[PDB]
Each structure stands twice: as C-alpha cells, then as structure tokens.
C-alpha cells in the first residue's frame, strides 16, 4: 500500500499547571476550595497535554480523540486568560516535522509563548495522525474504506485550517512544516487520497464504469496539482513527489480503462482500442519511471490482455477506425470529497474543564 501519511511533530514536555495556577489565584482571592478548584482542573489540562503530545505513538483512534480533545480545550482556554496582550509566560517548543535540520548542529525548533502556535502544531498532529490511521486501513474491506475516506477528509480540512490560520496566530515566520505552502500541499495530497478511496469503493462495489472513470479522472486532477506543487520544492520527504507523479498517471490510466469498458459496451470498438492504448502508454511510463514506488504489473496485464483481444477482433471482424486521442470526448470528473471544516468542538463528547469561568 503506497499511500502518503505525515509524521507527527515532536514537542518537549511543559508544566502547563503552574503558570495558570498563579494567574488564577491573582483574580481569584478565595484560597479555600471553590475558586482554587480551577487549579485542579488546570492540573487535568497539563495531564491532557502530556497524554495528547507526550505518549509513545499510537496509530489508533484512542490517541486521535485525545489529540482532538486537547485541541478543543486549548481553544476554550484562549478567552479565559486573555492571550492577545501577553501577561502569562508559557513557552511551547515544537520541532519541525520534516526538517532533519543540519546534523552540523541542531534540528529545526521554534519556541513561542503562544497559544496560537501550540494549537497550530496540535492541529498539525491531529491531521498527521488522521493521515496515518487512514493509510493503515484495509481497503479490501468496506469499513476500512469508510475509515480512510473519513480520516483523509478530516486531515485535508485540518491542514487547510492551519494554512488559513498559522500566520495570524503566530508572532514569527513559522517553521516550514506548518507554513501555508507546505500545509496547503499536504491538504491537497490528503484530498487526492480521499478521492482515490471513493474510486476504490466504487470499483469494489462493481459500480457503473462511467462513474468509476469520472471518479478516477478527478483523482488524477488532484494528484496532478499536488505534484506540480512539489515540483520545485524539497520540503516534503523524497518519496512524496514520485508517488504523486505516478498516482497521477495511474489514475488517468484507470479513467481511460474504465471509459474503454463503457465504449466496448456501446460497441465503439475503435474508441475502446484508442483508450486502451492511452492507458497502456501511461502505465508503461509509470513502470519505467516509478518502479521503486509502485507495483503496476497486474493492471498492465489486465490492460494488455484487453487491448490484444480488442485489436484481434477489430482487425478480423469489425474494422472500426481507431480514432486519435484528441478526437475523443473528454472523460468527465466527479468529486465526492471535501476538506472537513474545523469547527470546535472536533472531539467526541467534549467537556470544557474551565466552563465555570
């Protein structure tokens, strides 16, 4: 399985409790039970940070909901202790998800006394965990399919939220990993993989080849635009560009292949041959260029078996003219996929620890 997922951002442990504890007892004089119970809920919050961003990595829904709860909580804490004018000192330290950093001294780290920056990197990890769970699904299983489609759309929409938001939410120029350009490209990639899940669902359910071709054609568009975003950049890991380039051509070929079954059904045998020749050319390009990244052997065979039978019978029986590609109609496009908006709360059965305030 050749799906792209994103590694989690690392962060050093922080004592969330103390800098809040003291900032509570300033505007809460009664140091006996009621108003100093926010100081115990602030203890649960520090515990939540360590649970969300501290634990050994769990590629499971349990870890994701923790991460999402913590995002939700941070959004609820921003008005309580007005963070626009700085009066609290709390410094979060996050390492860049992709930048190795020169081994000639230090990785790429950014420390910022900012709720804006923390919730950005948190949301990044929600997106990146969602992407990893999506990619580990069993796509030869209908619930596996449903999980992937759901997690890719979540993540896509979460990267997009950061894109729109990072600059405003931070004081400094962000790290590259969360900059709008990197995170806009990740968004598109997750959206591409979500579309491809719909094509795999449609294929599995043996739906109408016309529909299946339209969903593959739209996947090809999303994969095309993503690689063209990586073409002059070296931010993402080195497998990403060639996997996207190949999926672009793998998807155009699936589009042509399913369109050619529609054509055969309609007895347009010349057009079948023309579409199948297109698909074989595309797939031969991926086999020769992207052999390290994708295994395209059985599709090549399916296509070749079909092209050979098609030519034989056209030559012997039908004698249709094989059209030029530029004379064929365009395959349509069907998108079944969107970037899930981030509207807190995004966690299940969310309770604001500081809802009294």
């Amino acid at each position: 399985a050749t799906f792209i997922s994103v590694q989690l951002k690392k962060t050093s442990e922080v004592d969330l409790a103390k800098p809040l504890v003291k900032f509570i007892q300033q505007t809460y004089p009664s140091g006996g039970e009621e108003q100093a119970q926010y100081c115990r809920a602030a203890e649960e919050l520090s515990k939540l940070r360590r649970a969300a961003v501290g634990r050994p990595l769990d590629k499971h829904e349990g870890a994701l909901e923790t991460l999402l709860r913590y995002y939700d909580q941070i959004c609820s804490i921003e008005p309580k202790f007005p963070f626009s004018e700085n009066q609290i000192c709390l410094t979060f330290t996050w390492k860049d998800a992709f930048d190795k950093g020169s081994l000639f001294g230090g990785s790429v780290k950014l420390a910022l006394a900012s709720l804006g920056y923390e919730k950005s990197c948190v949301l990044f990890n929600c997106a990146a965990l969602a992407s990893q769970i999506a990619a580990e699904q069993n796509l030869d299983n209908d619930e596996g399919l449903k999980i992937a489609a759901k997690h890719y759309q979540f993540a896509s929409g979460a990267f997009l939220h950061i894109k729109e938001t990072v600059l405003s939410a931070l004081s400094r120029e962000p790290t590259v990993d969360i900059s709008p350009d990197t995170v806009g490209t990740l968004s598109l990639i997750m959206l591409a993989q979500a579309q491809e899940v719909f094509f795999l669902k449609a294929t599995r359910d043996k739906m109408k080849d016309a529909i299946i071709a339209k969903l593959a054609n739209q996947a090809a568009d999303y994969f095309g635009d993503a690689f063209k975003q990586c073409q002059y950049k070296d931010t993402l890991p080195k497998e990403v560009f060639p996997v996207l380039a190949a999926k672009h051509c793998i998807m155009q070929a699936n589009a042509e292949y399913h369109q050619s079954i529609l054509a055969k059904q309609q007895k347009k045998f010349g057009e079948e041959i023309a579409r199948l020749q297109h698909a074989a050319e595309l797939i031969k390009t991926v086999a020769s260029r992207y052999d390290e990244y994708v295994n395209v052997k059985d599709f090549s065979d399916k296509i070749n078996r079909a092209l050979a039978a098609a030519k034989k019978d056209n030559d012997f029986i039908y004698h249709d003219r094989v059209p030029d590609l530029k004379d064929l109609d365009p395959i349509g496009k069907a998108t079944l996929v969107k970037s899930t908006p981030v509207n807190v709360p995004i966690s299940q059965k969310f309770t604001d620890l500081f809802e009294k305030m």
Binding site: K146, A149, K150, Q153, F198, K201, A202, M207, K208, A210, I211, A334, L336
Partner: peptide, 13 residues
Amino acid sequence: EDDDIKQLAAWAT
C-alpha cells in the same frame, strides 16, 4: 449516474 453519486456520498457519512 446522478443518483449513484448521491449514494456513494451518503455512504461516507
């Protein structure tokens, strides 16, 4: 066609 997209889309919910 139009209604087979509809059911794919609603499966995703």
